[PDB]
Amino acid sequence: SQHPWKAPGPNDLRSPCPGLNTLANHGFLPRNGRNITIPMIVQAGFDGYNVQPDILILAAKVGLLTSPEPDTFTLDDLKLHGTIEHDASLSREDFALGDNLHFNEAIFNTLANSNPGSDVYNITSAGQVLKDRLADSLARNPNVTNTGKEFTIRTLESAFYLSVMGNATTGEAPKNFVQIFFREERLPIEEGWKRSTTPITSDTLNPIAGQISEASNWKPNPDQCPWIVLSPNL
Amino acid sequence: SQHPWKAPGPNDLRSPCPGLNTLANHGFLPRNGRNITIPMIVQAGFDGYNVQPDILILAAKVGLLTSPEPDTFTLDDLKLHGTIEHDASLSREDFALGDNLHFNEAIFNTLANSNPGSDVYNITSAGQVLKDRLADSLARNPNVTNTGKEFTIRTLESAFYLSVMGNATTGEAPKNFVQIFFREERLPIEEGWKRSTTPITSDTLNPIAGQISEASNWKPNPDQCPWIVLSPNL
Ligand code: HEM
Numbered sequence: 001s002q003h004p005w006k007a008p009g010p011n012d013l014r015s016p017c018p019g020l021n022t023l024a025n026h027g028f029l030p031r032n033g034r035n036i037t038i039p040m041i042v043q044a045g046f047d048g049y050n051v052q053p054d055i056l057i058l059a060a061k062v063g064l065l066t067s068p069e070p071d072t073f074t075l076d077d078l079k080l081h082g083t084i085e086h087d088a089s090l091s092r093e094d095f096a097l098g099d100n101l102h103f104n105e106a107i108f109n110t111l112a113n114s115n116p117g118s119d120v121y122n123i124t125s126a127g128q129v130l131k132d133r134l135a136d137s138l139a140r141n142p143n144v145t146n147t148g149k150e151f152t153i154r155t156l157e158s159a160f161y162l163s164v165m166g167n168a169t170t171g172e173a174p175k176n177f178v179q180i181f182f183r184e185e186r187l188p189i190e191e192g193w194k195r196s197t198t199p200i201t202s203d204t205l206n207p208i209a210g211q212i213s214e215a216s217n218w219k220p221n222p223d224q225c226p227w228i229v230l231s232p233n234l
Numbered sequence: 235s236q237h238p239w240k241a242p243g244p245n246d247l248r249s250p251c252p253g254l255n256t257l258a259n260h261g262f263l264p265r266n267g268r269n270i271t272i273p274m275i276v277q278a279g280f281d282g283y284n285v286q287p288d289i290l291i292l293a294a295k296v297g298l299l300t301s302p303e304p305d306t307f308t309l310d311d312l313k314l315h316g317t318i319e320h321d322a323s324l325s326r327e328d329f330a331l332g333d334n335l336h337f338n339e340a341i342f343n344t345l346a347n348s349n350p351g352s353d354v355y356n357i358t359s360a361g362q363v364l365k366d367r368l369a370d371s372l373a374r375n376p377n378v379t380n381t382g383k384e385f386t387i388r389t390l391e392s393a394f395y396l397s398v399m400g401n402a403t404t405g406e407a408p409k410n411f412v413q414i415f416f417r418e419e420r421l422p423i424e425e426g427w428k429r430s431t432t433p434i435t436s437d438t439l440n441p442i443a444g445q446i447s448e449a450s451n452w453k454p455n456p457d458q459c460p461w462i463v464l465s466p467n468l
């Protein structure tokens with residue numbers, strides 16, 4: 001109740017990440033999306049979601065590469081293509097095709113309509129979505145980057161939405177909570193969402209991501225070396 | 235005079251980097267080599283050497299990957315092979331062959347004896363040293379990693395010793411200052427070394443590194459993708 005949802009205003013920077021954006025929209029991260037340090041990310045992920053430090057620390061260290069500042073980033077910086085941001089997102093367009101930053105319903109339609117006839121999204125549907133989103137990028141984006149780096153991140157992001165909106169042990173999440181999370185970047189509190197009472201860790205997320213990977217029918221582009229883009233000055 | 239040299243004691247952690255180690259040995263960085271943040275690196279490089287932030291910030295952000303902590307590293311963490319630490323060092327052995335952390339005179343002999351008959355090391359001699367050190371690694375290390383990432387770093391490190399011990403405009407450095415720097419990880423103050431009165435920046439270092447690269451007779455291993463090792467837990 002000390003962390004109400006408020007829509008970002010024009011000064012309030014946001015990322016391509018529903019996880020961080022929802023934390024900002026509740027004031028777990030700064031509402032203005034600016035001046036974010038690694039400890040702020042670690043604290044916010046714990047307080048909002050019961051996500052534990054190891055995975056947040058690595059992501060946040062990589063995220064600092066997107067920023068010219070010594071030890072902060074803004075949420076907008078994290079759009080930098082090829083650092084973390086990648087093609088075949090669940091809810092954003094590819095950088096070469098359109099807007100890699102903002103929620104897009106037409107892209108999200110695939111995830112929205114997944115697991116038809118169930119009340120949850122689960123590992124199986126999440127892998128089908130990864131398969132279909134990458135096939136779309138390969139069909140329409142001549143510049144798609146699809147290495148083990150991007151695929152690993154995509155499996156972890158799908159494990160994240162299942163775990164933070166759902167059950168972090170089983171990887172099942174109520175569809176309506178996932179929809180609100182992406183579309184509104186809001187914690188669905190009035191709708192009955194509760195913060196996980198089990199810690200969400202690398203040991204809970206990695207097995208879910210691995211099972212999603214096995215359900216994705218994936219292969220890498222064989223000619224592309226994985227890379228983390230190291231600065232936005234290129 | 236408020237930054238005297240003191241040898242590290244057993245609790246005082248050090249890196250594979252003469253630049254950072256010399257800063258610690260003078261107390262510009264903590265003498266114990268522990269609890270180092272990005273702003274500490276930026277401040278220490280400015281105060282000791284007149285090195286400016288951009289290049290320090292990127293290096294320090296990458297250095298955080300070597301540490302399990304949220305926003306610090308120790309100097310010892312920076313030994314992690316394949317993050318920054320690389321084969322064909324000027325003064326350390328390759329990880330697969332021996333000690334990748336401590337100064338080794340037998341390795342340093344090549345740099346020491348370079349530019350025979352001159353009172354300086356310069357771009358030409360620095361490129362000859364890169365050539366000979368990589369040839370040694372290729373001859374003796376079956377596991378050598380030699381991509382554009384490592385070669386770029388090696389050219390910048392050589393530009394660094396020339397610039398901080400010498401003239402940051404020309405890339406010429408008095409031999410005796412460079413020798414003390416590596417062998418003692420000390421600023422050669424009694425010997426006449428003065429901090430650069432011109433700022434050392436990416437715009438001064440990059441042209442030196444580029445000329446060193448052109449004098450190195452380099453080629454990459456064609457089968458190796460450049461990579462930054464992302465954690466020491468692997
Ligand atoms: C706190 C827990 C987090 C959760 C639950 C979370 C969740 C997600 C999800 C589900 C996506 C995929 C969005 C899509 O494909 O449309 C995503 C993307 C992203 N996240 Fe996170 N995230 C979290 C933390 C972080 C952190 C710590 C960073 C970096 C500091 C980060 C940076 C990103 C970026 C840059 C993307 C865009 C990747 C892309 O789709 O192209 N996230 N996140």
Ligand code: HEM
Nearest residue numbers: 250251253279293294297318319320323324325326391394
């Ligand atoms: C402050 C200015 C700096 C100078 C003058 C400097 C100088 C050097 C030099 C000359 C080497 C090569 C040593 C050798 O090959 O034997 C080196 C290596 C290294 N430096 Fe720096 N450095 C500086 C800053 C940094 C920073 C900011 C980091 C990271 C936080 C860093 C991390 C390293 C590492 C890990 C190595 C080992 C690479 C290797 O030889 O395998 N240095 N440095």
Ligand SMILES: *[C@@H]1O[C@H](CO)[C@@H](O[C@@H]2O[C@H](CO)[C@@H](O)[C@H](O)[C@H]2NC(C)=O)[C@H](O)[C@H]1NC(C)=O
Nearest residue numbers: 115116117118119120121122123124125172211
């Ligand atoms: C994800 O949810 C789907 C839908 O409920 C599961 O697929 C069903 O599995 C049951 C039991 O095997 C079958 O009787 C149904 O016919 C399946 N339905 C459809 C529509 O495919 C799927 O098993 C779930 N995945 C996981 C990992 O729990």
Ligand SMILES: *[C@@H]1O[C@H](CO)[C@@H](O[C@@H]2O[C@H](CO)[C@@H](O)[C@H](O)[C@H]2NC(C)=O)[C@H](O)[C@H]1NC(C)=O
Nearest residue numbers: 349350351352353354355356357358359406445
């Ligand atoms: C680095 O120093 C060497 C040694 O002084 C320079 O090579 C000399 O260059 C002069 C002028 O061209 C010649 O007369 C000498 O015979 C060269 N000496 C040797 C021993 O090679 C070299 O030019 C310098 N490099 C740079 C970039 O300044």
Ligand SMILES: *[C@@H]1O[C@H](CO)[C@@H](O)[C@H](O)[C@H]1NC(C)=O
Nearest residue numbers: 166167168169170196197198
């Ligand atoms: C999550 O699923 C696990 C495994 O089935 C179950 O034991 C636990 O009760 C579930 N969590 C909640 C809050 O229902």
Ligand SMILES: *[C@@H]1O[C@H](CO)[C@@H](O)[C@H](O)[C@H]1NC(C)=O
Nearest residue numbers: 400401402403404430431432
């Ligand atoms: C460094 O070299 C430049 C270019 O020759 C010269 O102008 C400058 O005086 C030198 N610096 C010092 C401190 O001698």
Ligand SMILES: [Mg+2]
Nearest residue numbers: 085086087089
């Ligand atoms: Mg994307």
Ligand SMILES: [Mg+2]
Nearest residue numbers: 319320321323
């Ligand atoms: Mg080395």
